[PDB]
Design a protein around this ligand. Structure first.
Ligand code: DQC
Lengths: 50, 50, 50, 152, 50
């Protein structure tokens, strides 16, 4: 019973999706994501106080 | 003052015939307060709605 | 069941700029923090037969 | 061409956040705020004069960039009410209570004839509502209790 | 009816569960609410499955 339940359970998957994700809403150490500095993205991606 | 009958916020109960009404108490025996209210449409129909 | 939606508040209505436009507000606040509404809510709005 | 006045406030998430200062301190998307750490009116006036002038002198530690909810709505009223504003964190962050015959916190620095407004998480009941005025409510709270979940 | 009576000047206080929306909040003045409320739904004693 335990083996069958464990086999059914295993399904990690779950790639990052979008702009509203639990992984992409708070920091950690396992998700250090970057972007080239002082360039187009980073300037805009700073004004959003939200 | 003017008040609207709508359970369970304000009740309306038949007047005890003598001139006052029932003397009841809470489950804790606390002094259930009450006043004397005259209102239309007690029964029947016309005659100033009784 | 379910959540709540379309919030509102059962105020006490009073005529425009009536002579008691303030004192009722004062008393209702001082009570509304002094554990009164909770007592009345326990004694009238909720029961425990369920 | 508009009025000039102070507003005094607090730090309680998510009403009024804190953001670490710039390279030089312009606040891209924020308001420039100052931490006095002192309940003295003349000191504050001195600091304001030093700040809005052609010769500034202030330790960088005293400057911060304030932003969030309540500041947002204050910005909407300043636009609608056509007046600029400064902003400085309160001395101690202790709300308003009676003690030793005195006041403290927001009211402590307000009834002392220092500031002109107060925007924050800030309750209203009896004692505060008597000594000083209050406006209409703009939020409807309650008291919830918190317990660690997922005992499994 | 009720609100209409309030615009008649024979009685003034209206002490009963009167809502406060903006349209009704033009001709009279209320106090700070003493009760929050909203439209809710019930279904049944939840007891599914076997
Ligand atoms: N309780 C109550 C109650 C209170 C009300 N109060 C109002 O002001 C109204 O318009 N409708 C209402 C309807 C109800 N109702 O029947 O549920």
């Amino acid at each position: 019973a335990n083996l069958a339940a464990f086999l059914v359970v295993d399904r990690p998957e779950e790639r990052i999706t979008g702009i509203n994700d639990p992984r992409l809403r708070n920091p950690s150490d396992k998700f250090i994501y970057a972007t080239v500095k002082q360039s187009s993205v980073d300037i805009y991606f700073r004004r959003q106080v939200e | 003052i003017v008040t609207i009958h709508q359970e369970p916020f304000v009740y309306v109960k038949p007047t005890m015939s003598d001139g006052t009404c029932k003397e009841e108490f809470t489950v804790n025996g606390d002094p259930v307060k009450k006043v004397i209210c005259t209102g239309p449409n007690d029964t029947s129909p016309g005659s100033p709605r009784h | 069941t379910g959540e709540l939606f379309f919030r509102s508040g059962f105020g006490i209505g009073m005529r425009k700029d009536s002579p008691w436009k303030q004192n009722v507000s004062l008393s209702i606040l001082k009570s509304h923090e002094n554990g009164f509404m909770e007592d009345l809510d326990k004694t009238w709005v909720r029961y425990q037969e369920c | 061409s508009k009025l000039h006045l102070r507003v005094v406030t607090l730090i309680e998430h998510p009403f009024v956040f804190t953001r670490e200062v710039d390279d030089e301190g312009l606040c891209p998307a924020g308001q420039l705020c100052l931490d006095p750490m002192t309940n003295d009116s003349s000191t504050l006036d001195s600091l304001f004069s030093s700040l809005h002038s052609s010769n500034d002198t202030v330790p960088i530690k005293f400057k911060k960039c304030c932003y969030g909810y309540c500041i947002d709505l204050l910005e909407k009223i300043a636009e609608d009410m056509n007046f600029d504003f400064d902003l400085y964190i309160v001395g101690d962050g202790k709300y308003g209570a009676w003690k030793n015959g005195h006041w403290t916190g927001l009211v402590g620095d307000l009834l002392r004839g220092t500031a002109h407004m107060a925007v924050t998480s800030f309750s209203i009941n009896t004692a505060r509502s008597q000594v000083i005025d209050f406006t209409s409510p703009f939020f409807s709270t309650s008291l919830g209790i918190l317990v660690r979940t997922r005992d499994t | 009816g009720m609100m209409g009576e309030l615009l008649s000047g024979q009685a003034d206080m209206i002490v009963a569960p009167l809502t406060i929306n903006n349209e009704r909040a033009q001709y009279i003045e209320f106090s700070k609410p003493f009760k929050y409320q909203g439209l809710t739904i019930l279904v049944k004693k939840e007891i599914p499955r076997s």
